[PDB]
Design a protein around this ligand. Structure first.
Ligand SMILES: NC[C@@H]1O[C@H](O[C@H]2[C@@H](O)[C@H](O[C@@H]3[C@@H](O)[C@H](N)C[C@H](N)[C@H]3O[C@H]3O[C@H](CO)[C@@H](O)[C@H](O)[C@H]3N)O[C@@H]2CO)[C@H](N)[C@@H](O)[C@@H]1O
Ligand SMILES: [Mg+2]
Ligand SMILES: [Mg+2]
Ligand SMILES: [Mg+2]
Ligand SMILES: [Mg+2]
Ligand SMILES: [Mg+2]
Ligand SMILES: [Mg+2]
Lengths: 260, 156, 183, 50
RNA sequence: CCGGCGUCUUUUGACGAACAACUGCCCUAUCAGCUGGUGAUGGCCGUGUAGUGGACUGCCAUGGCGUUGACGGGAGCGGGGGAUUAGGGUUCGAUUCCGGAGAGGGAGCCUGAGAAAUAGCUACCACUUCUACGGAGGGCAGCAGGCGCGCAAAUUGCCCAAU
RNA sequence: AUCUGCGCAUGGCUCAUUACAUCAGACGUAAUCUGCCGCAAAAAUCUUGCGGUCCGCAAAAUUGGAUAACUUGGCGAAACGCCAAGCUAAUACAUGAACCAACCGGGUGUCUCCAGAGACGCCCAGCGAAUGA
């Protein structure tokens, strides 16, 4: 039973500096994976500067002031990951955890109507006791009576206030996804062709808005809308478009010279 | 009219001091459904394993009673699917396959003949001779050395 | 203690394995139950996860199923008749899985008079007996030992694992298999 | 050999040290725990107690 | 009336555990046969396990490994990596991260979801401390230190302010 | 101060063991256990009160016994050693909830009908587990 993380064995997307202490806050089991989450001490202290250390950081959390998906989370080690909605009523800001196109976690600011729904991907389907078919989700939810057209690769729109699955997005050819793993993580694209290969990993071929073709495993894609215009959720400021490394290097030198 | 006339003992398969039966299905049903009964006569359990492997003519219409068999048991084929050539068939219902490969040495820019031998459980659906090329699928441990189980035999 | 590892087994080359750890608790085994006939005495065993595994010592009764009729009846074990592992386990009358036992046969006859109405007259209103009994027939080797008093049967549960002596009645070629080995 | 005598109808346990000469008459290799013995074996000032 | 908790059971995601093994690995033939009665390779009922399984009882078969270096002996944790390097390489990796193993040697357990735990228990062996002789204890490959050993490695320090 | 609930299986040290072992990349667990944590689930159980000797009328079920700390007396040279008695808690231990309060199913005896159909009665019908179909 591990209870510690070393700050070197912590994920790189958290961006904790190696010289500040040996340890990182090991996220508890919960909704999201340990490799694939951002625990609430890092959001309150390192992302947002509401807390200067971990001692000011539990003055916020243990008091019941941060809400992940409409419910107050008093754990600094609670795993918040992809598509979660983090509200704070006192400062009046609410955010969504999305991946930006460089693969890192990004806090997308939200309205009040956009902060009620979240988008969740089915990971398993089974029948529970009774004859109730429940749907297992990447965020750990077990929706008991989902839309009967739910398959495993699909996306359920959820509305975390009134816990009612308001919508369904099937996983087909004509849909748009966001990639949540691999080298292509954070990129958004239309689906082109899904190569099955039964017994092994499904490969999904994807085309971007510019036309850049790229592939991933189909367990890494997360469908978020009917097309790239009609996305069901708002995405970070690049909107899944990965610029060239040369062109994005030129633009920062131009912006820094034009600023002085 | 009250008497049923059940099936007689098939001594060709019954050799083994306990009665050889399949645990999946009951042999003794009076009005057995069309679920598991095969073409000619008797009740049989046959299963379709995964990866586009066609079950043989035996294991559906055969008479043998095999546990540890991928087509007629709870043995599931999963993980690795490999190929080898049959080396020895001297064991009872088990063959040893030989996997011959070239090992490249990065220093001396030249390959090197190596081999791995695997004990593979062989169903009575199959009779492979030495030199036959087989396709094996990984299963659970079935003995001290058996992890694989033959799925298809390619003759000669 | 008792271990279930391959550290003591020789390699397939015949080489000895040199041991560089202590025994783990996660690789243990325990002493066998050796369940016999007798009045019921069980001892639970604390397994992994805190689950309980009920050792059966001295069992005398179980739920035996008659699979053509898809019913079961709690009957009393009489004798241990044939065991495929050893004839020495018959003599000490050990209950294991798949050993052949004789059971009481009285609830099976009484059920066969209550259902199908055949003895080995009182509800004249309900002859749903006639709705059955026409298509169905009963194997002769069952009906002989059913009225003889004891029925040969096969244990289908693991008593040292579950603390139960459940079973099935021998039918078909399986009964005719074991009748030849006895007599 | 000291002796704690308790009277649980009132509590109030007190201690009374038994002499050598009062114990030399008792064979003492009987009288294990649980026995309801006559009290006068612990000196004859404890006459008639159990 | 309403709201924060706290708890049985049941169920599943998560953090894990345990097992299995696809490819890979220093030198040695002045080490050519290894295994199999007392499990060695396999098969049949069981048993045992958290589970698979010669893991194990009974029975049957006669196998399995090896000059493509088995078997036995010597060196010693394995990687990420370091040093040097035109290219090909040649070396080092006790050491911060990951994994494995151990707590004086060797066992055996209890409890618990998880230990064959050692700042837990039981026993023996080797050392060992207190005793009013009746008895009772020890386990620094934790951090400071101590004596030895060596060519060879620090303070019996301050503090939870940060991690 | 002590009961109780979690924790002490992590961390930290060291590298003695160790070559179909460990370990790396890659797979498997459909062969399995899994506290804490996340989202869920939940209709089993003739219990109380009062009166009468098994029944009646009632209903926010006002359940029961024991131990620590403590006191008393202490044993012992001591011991991260101990004894006996007297008190008293629970989210410890044990016991236990009718009707409100469902649907659905099986097996089965009398009663109105027709030349098999309905009503009523009885036994059984919860999650998990075993075996059989
Ligand atoms: N060789 C390991 C295995 O031991 C088994 O048999 C072993 C047992 O019969 C027996 O082992 C016993 C053991 O039962 C018993 N419970 C404990 C005892 N210490 C062991 O004894 C063995 O170990 C000790 C120390 O090494 C030796 O002194 C002793 O001579 C040796 N026979 O001796 C045999 C080993 O020499 C099987 N033969 C086989 O599985 C395999 O040989
Ligand atoms: Mg090396
Ligand atoms: Mg077996
Ligand atoms: Mg380490
Ligand atoms: Mg020694
Ligand atoms: Mg030190
Ligand atoms: Mg306690």
């Amino acid at each position: 039973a591990k209870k510690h993380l070393k700050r070197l064995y912590a994920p790189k997307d958290w961006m904790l500096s190696k010289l500040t202490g040996v340890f990182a806050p090991r996220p508890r089991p919960g909704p999201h994976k340990l490799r694939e989450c951002l625990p609430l001490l890092v959001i309150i202290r390192n992302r947002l500067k509401y807390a200067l250390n971990a001692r000011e950081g539990e003055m916020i959390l243990r008091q019941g002031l941060v809400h992940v998906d409409n419910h107050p989370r008093r754990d600094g080690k609670y795993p918040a990951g992809f598509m979660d909605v983090v509200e704070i009523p006192k400062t009046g800001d609410r955010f969504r955890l999305m991946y930006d196109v460089k693969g890192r976690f990004a806090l997308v600011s939200l309205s009040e109507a956009e902060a009620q729904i979240k988008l969740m991907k089915v990971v398993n389907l089974y029948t529970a006791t009774g004859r109730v078919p429940v749907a297992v989700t990447h965020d750990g939810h077990r929706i008991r009576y989902p839309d009967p057209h739910t398959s495993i690769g699909d996306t359920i729109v959820y509305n975390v206030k009134e816990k009612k699955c308001v919508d369904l997005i099937k996983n087909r050819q004509g849909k748009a996804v966001i990639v949540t793993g691999g080298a292509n993580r954070g990129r958004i694209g239309e689906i082109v062709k899904v190569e099955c290969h039964p017994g092994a990993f499904n490969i999904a071929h994807l085309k971007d808005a510019s036309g850049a073709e790229f592939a991933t495993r189909a367990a890494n894609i997360f469908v978020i809308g009917k097309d790239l215009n009609h996305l069901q959720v708002t995405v970070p400021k690049q909107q899944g478009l990965r610029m060239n490394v040369i062109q994005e290097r030129e633009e920062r030198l131009i912006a820094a010279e034009a600023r002085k | 009219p009250q008497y049923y006339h059940a099936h007689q003992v098939d001594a060709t398969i019954q050799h083994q001091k306990a009665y050889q039966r399949q645990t999946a299905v009951n042999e003794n049903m009076h009005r057995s459904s069309r679920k598991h009964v095969n073409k000619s006569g008797h009740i049989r359990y046959a299963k379709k394993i995964g990866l586009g492997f066609k079950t043989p003519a035996k294991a559906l219409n055969g008479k043998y009673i095999d546990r540890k068999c991928p087509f007629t048991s709870n043995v599931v084929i999963r993980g690795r699917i490999l190929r080898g050539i049959v080396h020895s068939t001297k064991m009872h219902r088990t063959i040893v396959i030989r996997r011959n490969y070239l090992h490249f040495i990065k220093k001396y820019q030249r390959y090197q003949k190596r081999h791995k031998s695997l004990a593979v459980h062989c169903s009575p659906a199959f009779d492979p001779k030495q030199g036959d090329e087989v396709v094996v699928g990984q299963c659970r441990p079935l003995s001290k050395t058996i992890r694989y189980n033959v799925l298809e035999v390619v003759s000669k | 203690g008792i271990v279930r590892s391959r550290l003591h087994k020789r390699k397939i080359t015949g080489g000895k394995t040199k041991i560089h750890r202590k025994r783990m608790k996660a690789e243990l085994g325990r002493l066998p139950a050796n369940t016999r006939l007798g009045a019921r005495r069980v001892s639970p065993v604390r397994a992994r996860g805190g689950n309980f595994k009920i050792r059966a010592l001295r069992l005398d009764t179980g739920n035996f199923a008659w699979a053509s009729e898809a019913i079961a009846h709690r009957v009393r074990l009489l004798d241990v008749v044939y065991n495929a592992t050893s004839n020495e386990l018959v003599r000490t009358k050990t209950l294991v899985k798949n050993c052949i036992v004789a059971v009481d046969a009285a609830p099976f006859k009484r059920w066969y008079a209550k259902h199908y109405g055949i003895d080995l007259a009182s509800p004249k209103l309900q002859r749903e007996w006639i709705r059955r009994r026409r298509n169905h027939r009963v194997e002769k080797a069952i009906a002989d030992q059913l009225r003889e008093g004891r029925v040969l049967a096969r244990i289908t549960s693991r008593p040292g694992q579950s603390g139960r002596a459940d079973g099935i009645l021998l039918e078909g070629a399986e009964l005719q298999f074991y009748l030849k080995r006895l007599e | 050999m000291k002796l704690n005598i308790a009277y649980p109808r009132n509590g109030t346990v007190k201690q009374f040290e038994i002499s050598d000469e009062v114990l030399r008459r008792v064979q003492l290799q009987d009288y294990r725990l649980g026995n309801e013995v006559d009290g006068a074996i612990f000196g004859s000032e404890f006459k008639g107690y159990i």
